[PDB]
Amino acid sequence: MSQEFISKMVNDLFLKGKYLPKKYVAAIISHADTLFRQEPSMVELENNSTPDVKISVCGDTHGQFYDVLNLFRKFGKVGPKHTYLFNGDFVDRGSWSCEVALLFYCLKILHPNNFFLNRGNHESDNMNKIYGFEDECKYKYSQRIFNMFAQSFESLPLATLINNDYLVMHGGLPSDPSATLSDFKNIDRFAQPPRDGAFMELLWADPQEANGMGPSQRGHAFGPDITDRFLRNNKLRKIFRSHELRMGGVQFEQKGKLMTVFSAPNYCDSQGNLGGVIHVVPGHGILQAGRNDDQNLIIETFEAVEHPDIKPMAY
Amino acid sequence: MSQEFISKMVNDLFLKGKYLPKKYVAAIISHADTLFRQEPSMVELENNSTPDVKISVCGDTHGQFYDVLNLFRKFGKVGPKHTYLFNGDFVDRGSWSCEVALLFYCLKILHPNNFFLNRGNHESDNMNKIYGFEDECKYKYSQRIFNMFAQSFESLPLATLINNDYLVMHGGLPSDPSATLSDFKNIDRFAQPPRDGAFMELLWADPQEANGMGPSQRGHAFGPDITDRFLRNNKLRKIFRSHELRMGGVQFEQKGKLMTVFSAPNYCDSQGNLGGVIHVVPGHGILQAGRNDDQNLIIETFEAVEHPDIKPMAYS
Ligand SMILES: [Fe+3]
Ligand SMILES: [Fe+3]
Ligand SMILES: [Fe+3]
Ligand SMILES: [Fe+3]
Ligand code: NA
DSSP, X not given: OOHHXXXXXXXXXXXXXXXXXXXXXHHHHHHHHHHHHXXXXXXXXXXXXXXXXXXXXXXXXXXXXXHHHHHHHHHOOOBTTEEEEEOSOOSSSSTTHHHHHHHHHHHHHHOTTTEEEOOOTTSSHHHHHHHSHHHHHHHHSOHHHHHHHHHHHTTSOSEEEETTTEEEOXXXXXXXXXXXXXXXXXXXXXXXXXXXXXXXXXXXXXXXXXXXXXXXOOOEEEOHHHHHHHHHHTTOSEEEXXXXXXXXXXXXXXXXXXXXXXXXXXXXXTSOOEEEEEEEOTTOOOOBTTTBOOTTEEEEEEOOOOOOSOOTTOO | OOHHHHHHIIIIIGGGTOOOOHHHHHHHHHXXXXXXXXXXXXXXXXXXXXXXXXXXXXXXXXXXXXXXXXXXXHHOOOBTTEEEEEOSOOSSSSTTHHHHHHHHHHHHHHOTTTEEEOOOTTSSHHHHHHHSHHHHHHHHSOHHHHHHHHHHHTTSOSEEEETTTEEEOSSOOOSOTTOOHHHHHTOOOSSOOOSSSHHHHHHHOEEOXXXXXXXXXXXXXXXXHHHHHHHHHTTOSEEEEOXXXXXXXXXXXXXXXXXXXOOOTTGGGTSOOEEEEEEEOTTOOOOBTTTBOOTTEEEEEEOOOOOOSOOTTTTO
8 A cells, every 4th residue: 555556546536536446445344443443432632742743633534525525635645744633424414435435545544543433323334325425336346345434434433532622523522421522432333333432422412502412403412501511521622523514614602612623625515515624733833812721722614616417315 | 364263263162072052153154255256266385485384274173173173283373484275075074074164264264365165076075964063063052053154165265276287176187188277277166076178177176196087986987188187278287186095194196297195184983093284395396206306395184083972964
């Protein structure tokens, strides 16, 4: 694996609407799978000690390869100076789910210490059957290749902690006031998300602005009182999560205790929304009234880009 | 991965009729899969340069965990002084196919340079469906774990070459007089065995003592004239292969040009056969009239051992 390999794959193959030989796909899915399996259920990251490493957090990409690429061209390439985290939901809906999954896997292999993924609710069997990926995968490669992706999904961490300040999961928090970091750490993640419990809430829960807890519009809703309690109990600053569309790519929520970052711009070729990113860069933050109250954070946004004459879920 | 990890797995888990947590199985199958996938379709091994590394070749084990263990207790453990190669057909028929697959995978991870596998015809979807592994795997673990094993099978090399003298595949040779080592080397192996072709012949063909080629008792039969031609064309000494039972564990065949090693003793709790092994140890061979004519080879054999009150294919 080399940057050379990714460039040819991206430029020579995926941008000409060609697929990788099935032997490479398998090698990639398998090497990525092995890497993530060595990782704890909650990855712990820091750049306090390494001043000039920028950590970026991105949200849903839902197989929008062309925006992912743009995201990379605008915000910079993954490297020793530049870690990234994708907070799940990178497959389904978009019609280049395989191409995103594969870049991410390659990147994981090439920069195992500068590239990170949380599982999102769509990196699951139930979701892929319904929402696109399975069909796209079977069409482009095979049932066996799909199974390989599906297995790899069980290996993805459920949450990632940054600078002991920010906790990041695709969905939200459990409403259990007992819940702690070590609870998330010890989760038996190599399986499908369960019906109830913190495993599913990490992947399914949405915040609300009302206090308390309740059923969501679609797991559960959790109010700013639940977030606050969790943050102070666990010596954190904020929650970052994704799982919901935000017209402005990232949204400052729950009186600052929470941010949603969503990185699938003009979602479903329809929403005309921005995608977002959250640089954690300690002490070089850029404050804005109503968007960022933290001196370690830069919030940027990005617009959708053109993509080939293909529908969403074209498979 | 450590020898510690294998010993607990073997002794504390598999010998008490318990299974590994599904998370370990997946990790193991996946780390082994990755390792083999880095390997060429024909692996090339040598101990000429490293005098005191013994290379052992074994044949079919068909999920007979207890004899595999014994094999290791008799012949010695895999290590920097002691490479091993299993020549396929380690799953199916025997009722501890998962346990053998898993030791082999662990061993591959622990000694990636001292442990080697050729794919055998049973390390395929068609065979596992019919012959036991799929049922055993689904019963003990899950469909997903079975698929993981199945995928890993596509990564296993099709042949292995030793000291540029001995060529080792599970089944046999193609009858194509063009066939060369580089032909085997360049095979797109990550797939199921095809209907015709050198891919399938490496895994399915049987030798015969009559000259020429023909349909086998079950791919094709290949005579001593085909072997000889292949050996001299390719600057080799012998073929080693497995895929057939031999009452004496290893058999010297085709006027010395070929040997069958088979390492599943008392096959199907029925045959009362010996299992075999072929040490290649350059210049410390032990010659026997009618068994070994090569000063680089030691042929040993081993007897079957007791195993728990379980039938063969107790899950099919
Ligand atoms: Fe989503
Ligand atoms: Fe989601
Ligand atoms: Fe066999
Ligand atoms: Fe066989
Ligand atoms: Na792997």
